[PDB]
DNA sequence: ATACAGGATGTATATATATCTGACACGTGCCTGGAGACTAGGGAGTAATCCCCTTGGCGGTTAAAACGCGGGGGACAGCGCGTACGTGCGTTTAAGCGGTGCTAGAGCTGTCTACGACCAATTGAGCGGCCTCGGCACCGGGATTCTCCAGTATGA
DNA sequence: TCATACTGGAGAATCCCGGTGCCGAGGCCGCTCAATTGGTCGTAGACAGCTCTAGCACCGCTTAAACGCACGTACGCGCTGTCCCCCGCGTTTTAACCGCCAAGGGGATTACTCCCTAGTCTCCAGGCACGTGTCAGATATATATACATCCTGTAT
C-alpha cells in the first residue's frame, strides 16, 4: 500500500536530489506529499475519463491533468 | 505546393487546417500560417542543432532524450521558455554544491 | 573501509548519469490503484498511464529534493530536515 | 533664641589671629521688603492697565474722554536640555531683554532651572515643569521628588499642591515646607548632650518631621561666627549653599535642639522650595513617642562629637 | 484504422538538412512533436487573446509577430522575427 | 510620667493646666509689632502708604496666604475684615491704589477692583 | 581657618528621558501597517521611475493615472509577498534579521531568474 | 535618469514592516531595488508590446491587467 | 458610449442575502472582474474539453465537468447541485 | 415569465451569458443548458463571497462593505484561498498574523 | 547580598461627538439586444460487430530489500563579543494640494476594397505495412586513477 | 620537545578496448484523400476626417517625512564542548521481473434515425447613462484606556 515506497527507494530519490545525510523522519513526509500529489492527479484523470463516458484511463488524460496543473510533461504524445 | 514557394520544410496546409479547426478565430489570414511555420521551423532547428552538438560532444550518432534534456538545461533562453516542462528519460544536470565538497 | 561521504557523492554521480526509474513498478501501481479506489471502484488502467504517472512523480520529487537541498545549504547546514521541505513547499506556493 | 517660622536674611595666639582677621515689593514672598529677599494721577494710573476703557476708567475715579483728548513630550525635551547642559548655588531670577535663555543666561550659568519668577519665555526649555503624578508622588519616579525641589502649588496641578490650603493634611506629601506643617516637639534635658528635642507623637519613615529655620548669612560671616562658636565647643552653623549659610543660634525653631548620632533616626535634606534653599529634617525610620531626634552632622573630624555611649 | 497526423517527416527532413549523418529515435520524435504542438497552441492562444483584446475577429501576421515577440526571450524572438519576415517576403513575392 | 515644660516659660506643666497650645503657631506675635515699627521707619512713604501696608501685612500674616489664587479671596477678606477701619482712617483711595498694584502683579482679577471699591463704598 | 560646619549635601540628579527598547516600535509599526491599507510607496517617485524604465523601450509615451496606480498596487503586492517569504526564510534560519541571501533563496525557490 | 533612487530607505522600511519584518539589515536596499527593477521591466515590456500591437501611442490600464494576467499575477479592481 | 457590467445583479443578490447592507464602487468593480475571470476560466475549460472529445457542441455536461475540475470538493459539489436544480427548473417550463 | 432567469429562479442574466459565449469564440456551436448552469454557478459563488463579506462587516460594526472586508473574507476561508491563490486585490491588505518566535517570554 | 514580584508612571492610544461633504442610492427616458415563431439539416444518440488491448495465473532467480554492529563526523547547547541596527532629535528637503493652459492623441463616423470564405476536380505529397542491418547494448579482460594510511620536515 | 603539514606509498571501484549479438530505424512499395487551382461573392478592416478630453508642464505655498548624526544595545558569528544517529559493510530474506499462456470486454468502427439549434424576420421593455437628493463616514478635538518600563519591597 503506502508502505510500498521502501526506505531505500526514498534514499535513492534523495541521492538523486543531492542529499548527503538524511534523517529518520523524512520518509513519512515524503510519503504524505506523494500521496497528496497522486490523489490530486488521479482525481483529475478520473474526472476527464468520466466525462469521456469510458472506463479505462489512457495516457492522454494524465497528460492533460499534468498540463492543467502547470506540470506539462513530454514523451507521451501530448 | 506552397512550402516550396516560401523555401520552408514545415507543411503550410496542415497548419492552415489546424487553425481552421482550432476554433481560435472566425477567419484565418493567408500570411499567418507561413509565419507560424517559419517560427516553428527555426525553433526546432535551434533545438536540433544544440542536440547534435551535445551528441557529438558525447561521441554518439543518434540523439537520445538525455541529449535533449542537456541541451535544454544548458541554454538560458530555452530554460526560460521550458521552465514548467518536464522531459521523460531526461535526467538532471551534473550539479554539486560547494559546501558538500570535502577539503 | 571508505570514509563517510565518498559513497554518497559516488552514488550522486551514478544516479545523475543514468536515467532509469528508481521506483519499481508493481508497488507504485498498487498504490495508484488504492488511491483511485477511493474515487471510483472497479477501474482499469493502462501500463502507459502508470508509467507516465511514475515519471511525473519522480520528476516532481527530484525537483522538490533539489529545492530542499538548496534551502538546507542556505540554512548554513548540511543535513535536510522536514522543516526544509515544509519551507520549500510554502515558498513554492503549493501550500495554503 | 527667638522663635522663627521662616529664615532671616542678615548682612593666646588665637586672640591675636582673631584680631588680625579684623585688621520695594517682593513678589517671591508676596509682601513689602521682606527679610528673605534683598484724580489726575488716578486716571494716569488707570490708563496704564485699562487702555481706554472709559466705562471703568471713569467708574474707578465724557469727562474722562474730554481730559484724554486734552492731554493728547515637551517636558522630556527639557530633561534632555538638563542632561546636555556637589556645589549648589542659590537661585535668582533671570531677565533677557531681547533674547531667550541661552548658555549666557545666569540660570544655566549657575546650573539651575528657571522658575515662575523668571521673566523668560513661557516655554523656556530651562523652566522646570511640575509633575504629572496622581498621588503623593514621593518616589524617585516623580520628577519633583527626584529633583529635591518640592511640588509647586501652581504647576503640579494633579498631585494636589494647588488644592485647599486650610487642611494642611493634603494629598501631595511634597509640600510640607510650603505649609510648614511640622510635628509637635518637646524640649527636655537630653540624655546625650545638654538639652534636646523629642517628638510628641509617633511618625513613619521618610515623613517630613520639621524645617530647620535659621538666619541666612554670607559665606564669610559663616566662618567669622564659626570660629568663636568652635571656641565655645557649641555651634549651630549649617552650610546652606555656596552663596549663604544658616545660623539658627540667635533665632530659629525648636528643632534647633536636635543632636547628632552616627546612627540617627532623622536625616537632613537641603531642599529647594519656591526658589528658597531650606533645610528640612525627615524621619529616617519609624519613630515612636518620646524619642529624641538625631541626624548626621557629617563632620570630617570628631573634635567633640565622639562621646557615643548611647545604647 | 485511424489516420492520425504527426510531424515525423518534416522533422527528419530538417535534421537531414542540418545534419546528414545523424539519426534519431522514435521517443525523441514524439518529444519533438509534443514540443511543436505546445509552442503552436501557445502562439495560437496569444493570437486569440490579442484579437479579443482589440475587439477584432481576424488573425493576421502582425498578431503572430507580436505573440512570438511576447512569448520568446529577446535574442530568440529577434531571430524568429527575422525568419518570419523572410518567410513572409518569400511568400508575398510569388502567389 | 515624664515632666514637660513650656518653651517661653520654664515652669512645669500641671496635669490639668496644660491647655494644649503649640506656641509655635503660623505667625509669631513679636513679628507683628516688628512689622508695624518697621513700616513706620520708611522715609518717603506718605502717611497713607504706611498704614495700608501695615494692615495688609498683618492680614496676610494672620491668614497665611501661600498661593496666588488666594489673592482674590484675600482682597475680599481684607475688606470683610479691615474695610471698616479703612473708612475710619480715610484710606479708601490708597486702598484703591493698593488694589491697582495687586492687579498689576497678576494676583487679582480685574473684576475685583470694581467689586472691592463697590463693597467698601456700599457700606459708606 | 575653616569653621566646623555640618553639611549633608545630596547632589541629586534629573530623570533620564523615556526611551523604548529596540523591537517595540517595530511591532507597533507592523500592527499599524497591517491594519491600514494605504500605499506605502508614494506616487511621484514611483511614477518617475516607471517613466524612466518605459523610456528605454520607446520614447514619447503617455500614461494614464489609473494605469500607474495599478502598476504601483501590483508592485507593492509583489514586494510584500516577497518580503513575507524572505521573513519566513529568515525565521527558518533561527535568526530575526533578514539578509540578501534570504531574498536570493526566495527568488530561487519561486523559480524566478 | 537616477529615478531608481526614488525608492527611499523609509519606503522599503514601511514595505518590510507591512510584510512583517522586525529587523532589517543595511544591504537589503540594493537587492530590493534590483528585484523591483526586474519586475517593472518585465511588466513594462509586456504592456509596451500590447500597446504597440494596438496601433496606439498611449498605455491604458487594460494592457497592464493583461500583462499581469499573462505573468500569473492576475489583479482585480480595474475591469476585464 | 454604452458598456456592460454586472452591478444590478450583484446588488440584487446582496439585497436578497442582506437587505440593510451597502457596497462601494471599488468593490463592485472587483466583483465584476472576478465574475469575468471565473467566466473566462470556465469557457476555456469547456473549449479544451470540446476539442479533446472531438465534439463541436458545448452542453451543460461540459460545464458541469469543468466546474467539478476547477473548484474544490465541497464547493464544486454545491455548485453542481445548484446547476442541476437550475437545469431542472428551466426544463420544467 | 419572459426572462429565462425567472423561468429558472436565478438573478444573473442568461441572455448576456449566452451572447458572451456566442461572441466569445470558445466553440463552434453552443448548447441551450450551458448558460443557465453557468449563471447558477456564478450566482452561488458570488452569494458565498457576499455572505462572508456581510459576516465580516457585522463583525466590524459597519454598514458599507469595504475592500478590507472582502480581503478578510477571502483570506479567512480555505477553499476560496486555494481558488484565488494567484489573485491580488487592490487596497486589500494582509491578515494580522504574528509569529510565535518573535514574542518574548 | 542576590533574584522575583509589585506598584506606579509617562507614552501610545479606542472611543465620544458635532460638522460637511461627495460618493451612494434612487427617479427617468429610450434603445437595441433579448424574446416569439417557424424552418433545414447536420451533429449526435444508439444498435451492432470486431479485436486487440487489457487482465489474470504460474515457475524461477536473482538483485534488491531487510536487520544488526559500530562509529566518527554532525547536530546541538552554551559563553564572548563587538559591531551593525534601533531609537530619538535637529535640519531640510522633497512630497503634496490648488488651481493654470492647452494641445496631441483617443474615440466615433462615412466610405471603399482587396483579402478571405465556398465550392468543383484533381492529383501527388503524405501515411500504413515490410525489411535488412549497423549503431548500440552486453560482457570479459587489462590498464587506469583515484583513495586512504603512515612517516618526516617544520613551526613554536 | 610536542603539534601540525605535507609528501610518499600501498591499495581498491572504475574506464577503456575488443568481441559478439540484436532489434528499431531508414529506405521502399503500395496506397489514398486533403491541399492546390481557377473562379466568384461577400464584408472586416484600412483610410481620412472631425470632436473632445485628460496628460503634462507650471507655478506657489505648506508641511510631514527623509536625511544625517549620537548613543546605546543584543545577537550572528565564532568557538568550545558533549552527546548520538545514519552510513558502510556484512549476512539473511524475498518478491519483481521475465517469459509464457488463456481469456474476455470495453474501445474503436460502421450504419441508422432524429431532433435541436443556427438562422431569419419582427417587436418590445431591462438596462444604459444622466441627473439629483442625501446621510455614512472622513475630519478634528478631547477623554478614558492599555501598556512598556523603571524603581522598590520581599524571600532565600
Ligand atoms: N553628643 C555630644 N557630645 C558632645 N558635644 C555635643 C554633642 N552633641 C552636640 N554637641 C555639641 O553641641 C553643638 C551643637 S548644639 C547641640 C544641642 C546642645 N548641645 C544642647 O544641649 O542644647 C556642637 O557644636 C557640638 O560640638
Ligand atoms: Zn519676600
Ligand atoms: Zn534666563
Ligand atoms: Zn531663569
Ligand atoms: Zn528661562
Ligand atoms: Zn509628583
Ligand atoms: Zn510635583
Ligand atoms: Zn506632588
Residue numbers in the entry:
A (entry chain I): 25 to 102
B (entry chain F): 16 to 118
C (entry chain H): 40 to 135
D (entry chain A): 113 to 123, 143 to 154, 284 to 297, 431, 441 to 463, 469 to 479, 492 to 504, 533 to 758
E (entry chain G): 28 to 122
F (entry chain C): 562 to 685
G (entry chain D): 22 to 134
H (entry chain E): 23 to 102
Article sentences:
We assembled recombinant full-length human PRC2 in complex with its accessory factor PHF1 (i.e. PHF1-PRC2) on a heterodimeric dinucleosome (di-Nuc), which consisted of a ‘substrate’ nucleosome with unmodified histone H3 and an ‘allosteric’ nucleosome containing H3 with a trimethyllysine analog at K27, separated by a 35 base pair (bp) DNA linker. Single-particle cryo-electron microscopy analysis yielded a reconstruction of the PHF1-PRC2:di-Nuc assembly with an overall resolution of 5.2 Å. Using particle signal subtraction and focused refinement on the interface of EZH2 and the substrate nucleosome, we then obtained an improved map at an apparent overall resolution of 4.4 Å which revealed well-defined density for the H3 N-terminus. The visible sidechain density combined with the crystallographic models of the PRC2 catalytic lobe and of the mononucleosome enabled us to build a pseudo-atomic model of the histone H3 N-terminus spanning residues R26 to K37. Specifically, our structure suggests two hydrophobic hotspots, the first one involving H3 A29/P30 and EZH2 residues F667, A697, V699, I708 and F724 and the second one involving H3 V35 and F542, F557 and P558 of EZH2. The side-chain density of H3K36 suggests that the epsilon-amino group of H3K36 engages in a polar interaction with the carbonyl group of Q570 and possibly in long-range electrostatic interactions with the phosphate backbone of the nucleosomal DNA. Taken together, our analyses reveal an extensive network of interactions between EZH2, the nucleosomal DNA and the H3 N-terminus.
PRC2 trimethylates lysine 27 in histone H3 (H3K27me3), a modification that is essential for the transcriptional repression of developmental regulator genes that control cell fate decisions in metazoans. In particular, the H3K4me3, H3K36me2, and H3K36me3 marks present on nucleosomes in transcriptionally active chromatin directly inhibit H3K27 methylation by PRC2.
